[PDB]
């Protein structure tokens, strides 16, 4: 009694969303070139290749993999400040690449960056970079507290 109803529902659901494509400007669009979404899901991340709960990196397992792949017995463990400096010199050159232009095309004056009225694309990337920095800061803080 449920098979037929589920089949009909799937058929019509597919008939609705039949022609939606992620265009090369990173906008989901329909056949008539009417933009339905400006970025898929707000982040442009395909769920097929996400490795965590609503995050794409699974920080703990990736950190363990990096630890094990590059573990030599005679290596000088850096101080936590050195770890943070490495994180900020690898992450932050990428953060500079995103500038958060205003809706009028001008640049935000560094005092109203988080004014909640100037958010746009590349916000997900900034949040991801901040999460990476926070995770590395947590590891360094654990080392310092030890």
């Amino acid at each position: 009694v449920k098979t037929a109803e589920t089949g009909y529902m799937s058929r019509r659901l597919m008939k609705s969303l039949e022609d939606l494509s992620c265009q090369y400007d990173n906008t989901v669009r329909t056949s008539a070139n009417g933009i339905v979404q400006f970025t898929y899901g707000g982040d442009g991340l395909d769920p097929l290749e996400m490795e965590g709960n609503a995050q794409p990196v699974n920080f703990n397992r990736s950190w363990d993999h990096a630890y094990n792949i590059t573990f030599n017995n005679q290596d000088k463990g850096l101080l936590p400040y050195a770890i943070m400096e490495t994180a900020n010199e690898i992450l932050g050159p990428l953060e500079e690449r995103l500038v958060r232009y205003d809706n009028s095309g001008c640049l935000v004056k560094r005092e109203d960056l988080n004014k909640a009225e100037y958010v746009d694309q590349y916000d997900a990337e900034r949040d991801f970079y901040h999460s990476l920095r926070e995770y590395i800061n947590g590891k360094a803080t654990a080392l310092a507290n030890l």
């Binding site: 799937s10 058929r11 597919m14 039949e18």
Partner: protein
Amino acid sequence: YQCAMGKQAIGAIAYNQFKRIDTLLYLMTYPQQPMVKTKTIELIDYDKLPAGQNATVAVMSYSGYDIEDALVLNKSSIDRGFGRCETRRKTTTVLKRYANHTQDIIGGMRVDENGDPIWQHQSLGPDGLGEVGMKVQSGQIYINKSVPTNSAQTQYREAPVIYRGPEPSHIDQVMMSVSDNDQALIKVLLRQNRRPELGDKFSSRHGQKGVCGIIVKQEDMPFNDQGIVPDIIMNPHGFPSRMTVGKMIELISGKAGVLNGTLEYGTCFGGSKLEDMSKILVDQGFNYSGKDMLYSGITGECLQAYIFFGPIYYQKLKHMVLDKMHARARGPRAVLTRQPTEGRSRDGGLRLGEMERDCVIAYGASQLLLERLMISSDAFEVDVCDKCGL
């Protein structure tokens, strides 16, 4: 599920099953009375015309070819005759008398050089009706029927009946008679002896339907202290999620009854108690739970777990792979839309419908979609006017 699939279990049909010309009969060569009977089956005479055989089942994960409901049939038991079946199919022919006082002549049996019949008539006989006991193949006319071209007598268009089958079958009955209106009627029965090939469906009288996953030799099979090898090795994973404890009790009751030389009763709300069967099983020197300790047939050492071992009444179902294999490259196409036909009696393709094309769309495969739904299905070179698009 057992009530559903017990109707489609091949076996004895009637005492006159050999004097009968039906459209499609499935018969069992060596049907066997069930070990664990029921008070109902004595009343409906199911122990006199059974459909199944008592297979020595060993419930054990073996060979890997029995993962999901798949079975492991035992070669050297199929050879001795186990699941051997027969398919009888009738072909009728009416020699109608047309209103123009013209009949249909079954004259045939052409001869090539140096006498002898031609290959297509090699199994036809002098009278145009296939010789009883011969073998026919693709081609091999066995009813050489001719029909007048002036039905609306010399001009006889030949319209023979051709055996169009994938495997040879034998002619075992040819009946010629007339109906009330005095018109000739010929019924030819073709028998085909079938072997339990890989891919045939076997049921277990408990809803444990399965396919013959693999056929392995006798020596590559577990054996007990007495050298018994199982005929069927059913996977143990069919039980824990379907809760067919009745099947385990059937195995124990059957083993105990056959060791005691009697037929045990499995009937609803009663039947042979498990305690008596276990007492009989331990009296003969077997384990109280029916779990013997086997030797691996390929390494020759003990199996580190005792194996549920005993006779289970397994019935072979009619859904055989020989009748279901079907492939097409090119052939008949529909007259209207010029697309391949649908059935199997007509060599036709497999329909790739809306769900399948949506699945292809999901992958984002455009050239494959174009090839499947246009190039390999129906392509037409049309001439469209560039001014008025007609």
